[PDB]
């Protein structure tokens, strides 16, 4: 219908202008807090900021998109047509590849366990343009239905299609698979370490309650068997604050020595419990509360704060991935099925709905850093305090 597509053509440009100004403002804020501080920046954060400037370069083009959607035809040249449609393509592959190497960096720092960062940034920015060279050469303002539009068309055989499919798979299916594999292994690693910290701590207290009400030596041996196995496993636990540190660090050696004392007090109580002594085994288990409160619970809450901080840190970049994979995914599926096949109101409506959905993503990323971000929110108040004087 002409009325429904005109309703979409009126809905698009002011949402485009609002998204342009909001994404532009939030992105300058992210950039200035990235540039004004260097001692706190991280490698994953270098990627996070590159995706930011990429959406700045995208956000400078929505005035042209708003003008062309308001006029109803590509008032511009075919040259600009590809100019814009490539900028959006390098935004897409910059987002995909930067989140892919964010996933690999977090896989290295979590599952497997910088002066050369600019070379890595220049590699990703280039690879995006390479996978966008097909977008640059395949899009030219043409004429259909009496109006000029900025859209790609497969016309005049083997080289074009071959490279198009190759680059497509290399930048989309391959990375996405790397991302879901790395993020599932990270989530399974961090949640198991939450479980291994808790269940080793759960049985070091629950079985201590069984000792005080056992009334014979038979249950004291079976309770202390589980606590010697729990304290041996909990000594082997590597916290994320000590995962990057050396295994022979002096901070870890105090944590291991507390479990070298705690198992030796289980061993003293097990030595009494095998002799049939029930009162002396419970009394030797009273010193197990003393050492836990002075060696282990000090390192339990330090590990339970660092591990949950990493879960808090991993939940904002997966949400950054999931927002990027909810906005920029259905628009590229629309532009792939149109080139694959070469009522009618539904196709034009779903084209424009995903057109404004993927273009919204330049606003949705500074939204996530302000809401569930743990580094941008603290340092945005830092630069606001230094200027409000």
């Amino acid at each position, epitope marked *: 219908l002409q009325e429904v597509r005109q309703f979409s053509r009126a809905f698009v440009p002011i949402a485009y202008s609002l998204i342009c100004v909001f994404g532009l403002l939030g992105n300058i804020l992210v950039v200035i807090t990235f540039a004004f501080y260097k001692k706190a920046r991280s490698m994953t954060d270098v990627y996070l900021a590159n995706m930011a400037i990429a959406d700045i370069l995208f956000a400078l083009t929505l005035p042209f998109w708003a003008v062309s959607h308001a006029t109803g035809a590509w008032v511009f040249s075919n040259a600009t047509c590809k100019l814009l449609k490539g900028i959006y393509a390098i935004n897409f592959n910059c987002g995909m590849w930067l989140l892919t190497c964010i996933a690999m960096d977090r896989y290295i720092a979590i599952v497997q366990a910088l002066p050369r960062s600019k070379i890595i940034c220049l590699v990703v920015w280039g690879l995006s343009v390479i996978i966008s060279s097909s977008t640059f050469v395949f899009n030219q303002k043409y004429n259909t239905q009496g109006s000029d539009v900025c859209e790609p068309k497969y016309q005049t055989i083997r080289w074009k299609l071959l490279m198009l499919g190759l680059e497509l798979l290399f930048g989309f299916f391959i990375p996405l698979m790397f991302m879901i594999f790395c993020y599932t292994a990270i989530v399974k690693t961090l949640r198991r370490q939450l479980a291994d910290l808790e269940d080793n701590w759960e049985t070091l207290n629950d079985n201590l309650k069984v000792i005080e009400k056992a009334d014979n030596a038979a249950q004291v041996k079976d309770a202390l068997t589980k606590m*010697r*196995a729990a304290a041996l496993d909990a000594q*082997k636990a590597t916290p994320p604050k000590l995962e990057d540190k050396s295994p022979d660090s002096p901070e870890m050696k105090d944590f291991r020595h507390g479990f070298d004392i705690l198992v030796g007090q289980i061993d003293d109580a097990l030595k009494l419990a095998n002799e049939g002594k029930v009162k002396e085994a419970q009394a030797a288990a009273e010193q197990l509360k003393t050492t836990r409160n002075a060696y282990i619970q000090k390192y339990l809450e330090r590990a339970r704060s660092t591990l949950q901080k990493e879960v808090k840190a991993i939940r904002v970049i997966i949400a950054v991935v999931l927002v990027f994979l909810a906005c920029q995914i259905p628009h590229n599926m629309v532009l792939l099925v149109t080139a694959a096949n070469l009522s009618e109101k539904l196709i034009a409506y779903t084209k424009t709905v995903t057109e404004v959905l993927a273009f919204l993503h330049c606003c949705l990323n500074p939204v996530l850093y302000a809401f569930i971000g743990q580094k941008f929110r603290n340092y945005f108040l830092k630069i606001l305090k230094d200027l409000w004087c």
Partner: antibody
Framework: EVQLVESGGGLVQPGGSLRLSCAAS????????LHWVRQAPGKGLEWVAY????????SYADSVKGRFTISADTSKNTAYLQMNSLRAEDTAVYYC?????????????????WGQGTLVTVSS | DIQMTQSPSSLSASVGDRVTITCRAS??????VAWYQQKPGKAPKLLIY???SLYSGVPSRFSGSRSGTDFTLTISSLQPEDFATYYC??????????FGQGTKVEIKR
């Protein structure tokens, strides 16, 4: 050169008594806990008893409790196993193995050096 | 108390093969599992201690792993001189030692 040498395994009657003298060399008794693992002919390894002569913590398996008595002395640097009221099920090859004290690495090396064993045949 | 279950009680392999013996603990035995090799008529010899660590004098083809209460001994390349019986043993405590039932590795024919 660290080694454990068993002796005293032989031929006894049911209900008899014999002492197996596991000697040692190259290391002392009070820095290594000595255990007895026996192996019946055609069967697997079964733990029997242990002693920690630095303190004295003689524990036994439930099949040998009361009848068996493990002992050691550090002047001669040997270990002993006094077995009484033997049945046909005690016919085995008796190994003595050393195992270090908690904490550190030598506790984790469980039974790193074994003795060659002595055969005890209990039959009427 | 704590039981030890060694699954492949008879194993047939040839020279150059890759072997895998699985031992499982009844309770939580927390990496306190050793592996032993015994030739017939001889004392056992420690191969892998602490469920993964390779003992000195043991060649690098032998290896160990732990996945919870499941434990695994692996020989990568099987030489003719390691046709013997293999025992797993939990050692959570001095008085708590229980061995596996034993797996004998024979020549494939």
């Amino acid at each position: 050169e660290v080694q454990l040498v068993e002796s005293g395994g032989g031929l006894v009657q049911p209900g008899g008594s014999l002492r197996l003298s596991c000697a040692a060399s190259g290391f002392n008794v009070v820095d290594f806990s000595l255990h007895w693992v026996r192996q019946a002919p055609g069967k697997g390894l079964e733990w029997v008893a242990y002693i920690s002569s630095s303190s004295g913590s003689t524990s036994y398996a439930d099949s040998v409790k009361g009848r068996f008595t493990i002992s050691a002395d550090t002047s001669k640097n040997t270990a002993y196993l006094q077995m009484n009221s033997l049945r046909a099920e005690d016919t085995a090859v008796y190994y003595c193995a050393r195992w270090g004290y908690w904490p550190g690495e030598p506790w984790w090396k469980a039974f790193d050096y074994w003795g060659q064993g002595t055969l005890v045949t209990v039959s009427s | 108390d704590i039981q030890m279950t060694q699954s492949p009680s008879s194993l047939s392999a040839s020279v150059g093969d890759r072997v895998t013996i699985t031992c499982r603990a009844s309770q939580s035995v927390s990496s306190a599992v050793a592996w032993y090799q015994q030739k017939p008529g001889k004392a056992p010899k420690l191969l892998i201690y602490s469920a993964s660590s390779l003992y000195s004098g043991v060649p690098s083809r032998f290896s160990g792993s732990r996945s919870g209460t499941d434990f695994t001994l692996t020989i990568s390349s099987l030489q003719p001189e390691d046709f013997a019986t293999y025992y797993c043993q939990q050692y959570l405590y001095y008085s708590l030692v229980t061995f596996g039932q034993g797996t004998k590795v024979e020549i494939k024919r």
